[PDB]
Ligand binder design. Structure first.
Ligand code: HEM
Ligand SMILES: CC[C@H]1OC(=O)[C@H](C)[C@@H](O)[C@H](C)[C@@H](O)[C@@H](C)C[C@@H](C)C(=O)[C@H](C)[C@@H](O)[C@H]1C
Ligand SMILES: C[C@@H]1O[C@@H](O)[C@H](O)[C@H](O)[C@H]1O
Ligand code: NA
Ligand code: NA
Length: 397
């Protein structure tokens, strides 16, 4: 069965959805693909109802996907101690190590700190004058500062952990051996920061991770340190890219930006809609393997068959969202899965929402004249990574 198409279906263009995803949702919503690594074939799931089953059911296992022969989107076999590769109830125990810092209530308590950080960084951009690179002054330093303060990672390590993090998000830019090397380096660095808390615990998540290493009974050192790596990767890589992505959607059809200048209270709802609209995950997902037969819309997936979701395709499902292909800030309902679903639903969802809200609210309030000040055709979209975003975004005002 080398008659099954390669997935991804193409090198990506900006934030475009391959038009094949809409054809798949209409006519073949569950279809066999060959992923770029591991062996064999995977079902690609393109509709919302099927995505909620694959993401939401104990009969689908991520643990089972750690087999190096399992199809996957990324060069290195999955790390078995990785939070994504855990199944409940062990996954539930692992998430509770840190989950209290990420509840909507605790995240809301960060809004003051977070708005202060944004204000200061836009002051520096103003000091530099127009035009300036929004990536340099906002999209990079803002989420990096927030995740360093929440975990207790020194800000001086920015260049070191951003390099490791970009490598671990490789799709084609690096080989398995280059990434496996970075994984070991990152594991050894994070293990070292957590060890610093041996006779010196801190009031931060690394503090919590170091106590769990000392006192905790069901979780390995590996699982615990790896959680530190996942949070430090996700905690900046998502938001840094999503700020560039959402600003890109706002300035390339400037009525969108103008609608938020007019009404900055629209910003929370605009952030939800642009989370729906944006393929932050360039293609596919961490894989789920059926442990029993499971009925999806058009097929029964057999025990042992792997499945992969395209989150941004589920987020264009025309049986769930009216005019799904259109950016609409006035949707009454937006049941998107930009943050996933089921056990592995994004732990940082509330922190992402907060950072995007405060970054956009500030821009829309203080920079009514904001425009893209480099050509669209020349935009430096990140190539060869599992996520999408801009290396640079020169803006004027
Ligand atoms: C706009 C921001 C974000 C987006 C769009 C986003 C998106 C996602 C998605 C779709 C997943 C599900 C992956 C899957 O099940 O296959 C996920 C999981 C995850 N996200 Fe986020 N995320 C964001 C922000 C964050 C932040 C700020 C953090 C960390 C502070 C974070 C940490 C994670 C982690 C650790 C997981 C894995 C959770 C688990 O396996 O239980 N994310 N994210
Ligand atoms: C195949 C696409 C996915 O990538 C992966 O699985 C990566 C190899 C993970 O190891 C990354 C590096 C982890 O750090 C995650 C915790 C990051 C967090 C933001 C996500 O879960 C993210 C959505 C992720 O699932 C997708 C990018
Ligand atoms: C941060 C993330 O952590 C786990 O999910 C993986 O095993 C891997 O080490 C890394 O990609
Ligand atoms: Na742009
Ligand atoms: Na996988």
């Amino acid at each position: 069965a080398d008659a099954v198409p390669a997935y991804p279906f193409s090198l990506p263009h900006a934030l475009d959805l391959d038009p094949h995803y809409a054809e798949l949702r209409r006519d073949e919503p569950v279809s066999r693909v060959r992923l770029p690594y591991g062996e064999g074939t995977a079902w690609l799931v393109t509709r919302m109802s099927d995505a909620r089953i694959v993401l939401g059911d104990s009969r689908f296992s991520t643990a089972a996907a750690t087999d190096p022969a399992t199809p996957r989107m990324f060069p290195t076999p999955p790390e078995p101690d990785g939070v994504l590769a855990q199944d409940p109830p062990d996954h539930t125990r692992l998430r509770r190590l840190v989950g209290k810092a990420f509840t909507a209530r605790r995240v809301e308590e960060m809004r003051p700190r977070v708005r202060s950080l944004v204000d200061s960084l836009l002051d520096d951009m103003v000091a530099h004058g127009s035009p300036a690179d929004l990536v340099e002054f906002l999209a990079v330093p803002f989420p990096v500062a927030v995740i360093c303060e929440l975990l207790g990672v020194p800000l001086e390590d920015r260049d070191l952990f951003r390099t490791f993090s970009d490598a671990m998000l490789s799709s084609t830019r690096l080989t398995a051996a280059e990434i496996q090397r970075v994984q070991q380096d990152f594991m050894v660095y994070m293990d070292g920061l957590v060890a610093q808390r041996r006779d010196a615990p801190t009031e931060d998540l690394l503090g919590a991770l170091a106590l769990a290493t000392d006192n905790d009974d069901h979780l390995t050192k590996g699982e615990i340190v790896n959680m530190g790596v996942s949070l430090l990767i996700a905690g900046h890589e998502t938001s840094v890219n999503q700020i560039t992505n959402l600003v890109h959607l706002l300035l390339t059809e400037r009525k969108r930006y103008e609608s938020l200048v007019a009404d900055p209270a629209l910003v929370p709802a605009a952030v939800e809609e642009m989370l729906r609209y944006t393929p932050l995950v360039s293609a596919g997902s961490f894989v789920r393997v059926a442990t029993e037969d499971v009925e999806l819309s058009t097929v029964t997936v057999r025990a042992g068959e792997p499945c992969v979701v395209h989150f941004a395709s589920a987020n264009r499902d025309e049986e769930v969202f009216d005019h799904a292909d259109e950016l609409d800030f006035h949707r009454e309902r937006n049941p998107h899965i930009a943050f996933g679903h089921g056990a592995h639903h994004c732990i940082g969802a509330q922190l992402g929402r907060l950072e995007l809200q405060e970054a956009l609210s500030a821009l829309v309030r203080r920079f009514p004249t904001l425009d893209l000040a480099e050509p669209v055709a020349g935009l430096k979209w990140k190539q060869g990574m599992l996520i999408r975003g801009l290396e640079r975004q020169i803006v004027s005002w």
